[model samples]
Target: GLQDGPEPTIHTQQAYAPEDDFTAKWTRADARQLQRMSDPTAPSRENSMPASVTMPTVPQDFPDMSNEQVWVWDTWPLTDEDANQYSVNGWEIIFSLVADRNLGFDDRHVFAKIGYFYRPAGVPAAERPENGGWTYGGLVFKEGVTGQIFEDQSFSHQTQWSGSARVSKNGEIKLFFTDVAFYRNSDGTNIKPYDPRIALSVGKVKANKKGVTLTGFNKVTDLLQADGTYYQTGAQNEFFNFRDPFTFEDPAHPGETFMVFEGNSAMQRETATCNEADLGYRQGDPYAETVDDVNASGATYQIGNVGLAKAKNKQLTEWEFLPPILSANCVTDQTERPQIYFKDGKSYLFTISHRGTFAAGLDGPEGVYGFVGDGIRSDYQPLNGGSGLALGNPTNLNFLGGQPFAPDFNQHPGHFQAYSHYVMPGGLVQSFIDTIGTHDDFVRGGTLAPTVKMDIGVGGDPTKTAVDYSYGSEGLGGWADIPANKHLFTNGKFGVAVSDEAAQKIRKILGSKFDDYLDGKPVSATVRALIEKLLAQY
Candidate 1:
């Protein structure tokens, strides 16, 4: 396996369409090779499709200003393809957009950072690329797991990590992070290799400060082992990958701290028969604490009113379809990762919806949805109906979701934390057309060029109603629809511009500082060609 090269035959598909009945394949092989391979029975095979089924083109002469303003921006390709290539995997970007009241800019600022993680790009060629090639890189923290892989420990698939920086009401910048390791194996077996543990870190920094000082390094839960762990078959698994660890000071009891996150759906409810009333009435009670309290005596953790304790302690123990309301029809599937923000005296829960099965459509899996409530545990309900909101084409394999937001300056110095998911036609279609026209062998990389879009609204209070919750496509050589006003930018447009500016500036300033690879440059022939292709588009 270690000696095997990339598959000779590559297969690709596109999801979104700009037109009907348009079908083609984008490929890199020569004409004879492509023709020979087109035969399904060929020993070696190749297939491709156009970058987009219907290419939406914007006219250059379109007016820059319009009364109906929709913000739009484009995210640059991470790969160095000579054409649109979408295969770069290393940094994961999570970002948010913010507005400064004093500046009077409605959407003038964006905050974002690349979540740090280790990938085995530099390992010796003999190592297993799939299992050990990718290892954990040092996180952005001052001191944590950083640099070099250990002999016995290849990066375990069990651990998932994330971080956030926020500004307190008193104007203090607080940075928080959570690293959770699950007790299950990659195959869903109960081979608990590592204890289920979560580490929480908090730091505080002042305005214009150069450094952040740590305030808390508490472990929320002790290491959970197989002996004490109990698995619920029908419950959703929310804890496998945790996102958005929000820190809030208890409103009812100041100085008492609480952090609220979307809990594992499977772990949140004990039985499918449970309803929202069962969850709401149980809030502020001790019973909920038992589910997470590994250190508690035999069943002691299970004896208390778990729901009440979780709510009061800022934990959401039970999963509600439209949270805070009991519904018997709510399935046991876990709603993946969720992020919460407290603004305007309410708690807003932002998460990616997850349908139980892959074919259930994008509503539950590919898009972002919101829930708002009065207090940390107040009855939370979807901002819109449970039908939820979608940002872009969910079926696009390039689409990544559950983006994170940070309010502090160090992580997101000028803008909010953000992430991007792209929707473009598959590569096969584009390559097929290129072969017919110029014979340039334009290998249309999978639709990797991501158009960044934002879902804007108030953070807290489900009752307040979030306005302008819509989508916009940004920067694909002016191919997308151009809004009337340039100033009225989409979240995707603003985010892409900001991120591109940052990457370009960094590339410019650090041009000669190190070898090209260290500065995020491509070295391989295929990768270099890919980058060139993307650059030509810009």
Candidate 2:
């Protein structure tokens, strides 16, 4: 039987310095977009040029938030002396997310003008409606805008689309986003001619004083296995376990970078016995539960955890995905973004599943959960003697503090939709969601909210842990951070590859909109089909 291995390590949060490739606040392209938007000639809905800047408003008609869009968190603390209002640790966090798309779902991200917002800590009590300080550093397109932002002829599905970032050994920051082939659309349409597999987009992170420059995205459409094979899953068997590739360096294993993602077992487990090994841990484990009757008694559930991939060369291309780091089999068979959090000498392997919860059952807070380990490949024990939760928002209920915005009457923020969280330089853990929602609202994600605080502490007793959530600090805010040029130290050269297929598809779909290029044709489904056809062209 398996057992509750070890205590891992004595943990203490450290004030880490910003990475040399610290995700810049603004790229040259971003600065340019801001300057263009400031002009009176720009194509803008809310335009009057009153001298003061104007912000992009949300679509009047509700576009499903959860139905297709997803938000990925990549924030860091500010170390400047000018920051006083941001007392939530004397640091400002930059939220680089795809706020305008899918509602907030998917692994293959479609950047139809990624929404950028800057959230300042320290809440103002009288503040009620929302934060109007948001800034769209670049092109802010209409919600149901006519064409594609970038193309992928591979026909990747929009399902498991997710994103993560990395800095080259030099100074360039590489943001890797998930791509998929063949998925449905809003108006009930299907992508028929597609690869039906996951893809990757390695875009050079370019934000600065001049503006942002997002181009030359390398599409790693196929992920390879360690033995020089492509990663795969069972379609007819309903096992779509391949997406959300998070790239990071392992603290314990130096000089090597890994891509940790959410993947599922191609096969079922052996539940013939209740041993610790069979259950993935020891019996009576608080973070686990044994099923007496499921597909059948002792018929084990499929395992799910963070899958690992190592780059073999100095170029960092051609990643070889190996087996998963740990399998939380007593849980769901799908782990979303496998984020790695390093504190002191301890490492955390975290996963956020729409269907997973703290095995402590209904007892612990359960959104965006995690486990602690001594190193990257070390044994990750449940946070507190097995009964612990990193971040839990309650799957079946609305937020306790009541979100500022009203999701449609038919929707409420699904508890724990919070995807990822970060421990600020000053030691406080923070996370945010657009708004609260359920099935209806799930697809129709809510407006931006304030940052929520979580106590990522193990307490004086290493036997206990708490991811305490204080939600009132949640609400939308304007872009308030300084431009990215201040600290970013790169020009634009990643050596990352771009798919020839992506170029062809992008060319086919370019400017095919009715008013733009439809040649005076009336609006009809026929027109959309024509555009779709062009987008799918090889």
Best by lDDT: 2
- The models' CA-based lDDT, in order, is 0.25, 0.37
Q: Over the stretch 278-367, how does candidate 1's per-residue lDDT look in tens digits?
A: 222134433232222222222111111101112223322221111211111122133333434444555455444322211111112223
Runs in model 1 lying further than 4 Å from the true structure: 1-138, 141-160, 166-175, 182-190, 193-196, 202-244, 249-256, 265-329, 342-346, 355-365, 390-538
TM-score of 1: 0.36
Quote the positional error of residue 240 for candidate 1 in Å: 6.0
Give the worst 10-residue stretch by lDDT in candidate 1.
429-438
lDDT of 2 at 485: 13
**How much is 270 displaced in model 1, in angstroms?**
9.6
Model 2: per-residue Cα lDDT over 257-305, one tens digit each: 6777766544423421223343332335444434443224322343455
Residues forming the 10-long window of minimal summed lDDT in candidate 2: 22-31
lDDT of 1 at 199: 33
TM of each candidate vs. truth: 0.36, 0.54
- As a TM-score, model 2 comes out at 0.54
